[PDB]
Write a structure and sequence with these properties.
The structure is cut from a larger assembly and holds 2 copies of chain A. Chain A is of the alpha+beta class. Chain A contains 1 helix and 2 strands; from the N terminus they run ββα. Chain A has one helix at 25-34, and strands at 10-12, 15-17. Chain A has a two-stranded antiparallel sheet with strand order 1-2. In chain A, a hairpin with a 2-residue loop joins strand 1 (10-12) and strand 2 (15-17). Chain A starts with 9 loop residues before the first strand and ends in a 15-residue tail after the last helix. The relative contact order of chain A is 0.21. The chains hardly touch. Chain A: This is B-type flagellin. Chain A: It is found in: Secreted; Bacterial flagellum.
């Protein structure tokens, strides 16, 4: 990420995610794991990356 | 460097400068049921 982060959204069916500040895979991973309540889609980040 | 086993050849990328820990981390994983530890043990003895 050159000078900033990826402030994007995710619309899974009806509801729409409003995540922000994505610089690495881990960041998006935490954003999904937190939003697990709203979005009924489990995420997983292994040691691989 | 390439890996052989269980029909899963994978050219592990070892850049110029990567420490032993990084090498161990990279070579870990892809090849099934294989592990890779790292260890740097070095002594020292000051002369006159």
């Amino acid at each position: 990420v050159t000078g900033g982060s990826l402030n994007f959204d995710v619309t899974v069916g009806s509801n729409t995610v409003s995540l922000a500040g994505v610089t690495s895979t881990q960041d998006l991973a935490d954003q999904l794991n937190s939003n697990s309540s709203k979005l009924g889609i489990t995420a997983s980040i292994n040691d691989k990356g | 460097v390439n890996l052989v086993g269980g029909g899963q050849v994978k050219n592990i990328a070892i850049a110029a400068g990567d420490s032993a820990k990084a090498i161990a981390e990279k070579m870990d994983g892809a090849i099934p049921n294989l592990s890779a530890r790292a260890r740097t043990v070095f002594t020292a003895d000051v002369s006159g």
